[PDB]
Amino acid sequence: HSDILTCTHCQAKNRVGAVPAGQVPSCARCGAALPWLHDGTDATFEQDLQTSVPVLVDFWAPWCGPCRVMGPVLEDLARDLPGKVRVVKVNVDENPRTAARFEVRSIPTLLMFKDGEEVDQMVGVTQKAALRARVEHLNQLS
């Protein structure tokens, strides 16, 4: 599974799938760290968690009103913190095993993982500044 990550600096489209642990996606044209935001599936979820950077898993659905608001916020978060967070979007309509696994009840639900373990949970709309603060906090590496 692969997704296009667009470089903020030179505009290059970068098709990126699995990322070796210890590394973060970078632009193949100019070298800059990419905004690491992409779709995740039941099939890919365990691999999506195998990174060092904080992993922000966004359970969303087409019919969910607040998801239309939260999408752009997560997009800005990944752009502002390129390579310091991995945003994994999980369409619950299409990925029922992972939604059930984490006992998702409200849409949107945002879960934050660190080294494979759930470390935070945010139901409903969350301000981007609070998200940024929790991500930099986790980047202290704790």
Chain residues binding Zn ion by CB under 5 A are 7, 9-10, 12, 27, 29-30, 32
The answer to whether the bond into 108 is cis (omega within 30° of 0) is: yes
84 is catalytic: no
The nearest distance, CB 7 to Zn ion, in angstroms, is 3
The nearest distance, CB 27 to Zn ion, in angstroms, is 3
Task: Name the catalytic one among 5, 53, 57, 67.
Answer: 67
Q: Which two tokens stand for residue 62?
A: 């087409």
Task: Name the catalytic one among 12, 61, 64, 119.
Answer: 64
Please identify, using beta-carbon distances, which residue of 34 and 138 lies nearer to Zn ion: 34
HSE at residue 126, side-chain half, CA atoms within 13 A, is: 22
64 is catalytic: yes
| Rg (alpha carbons) of the chain, rounded to whole number | 14
State yes or no: 133 annotated in a binding site. no
Q: Which residues belong to the annotated binding site for Zn(2+)?
A: 7, 10, 27, 30
Which residues are catalytic, by number? 64, 67
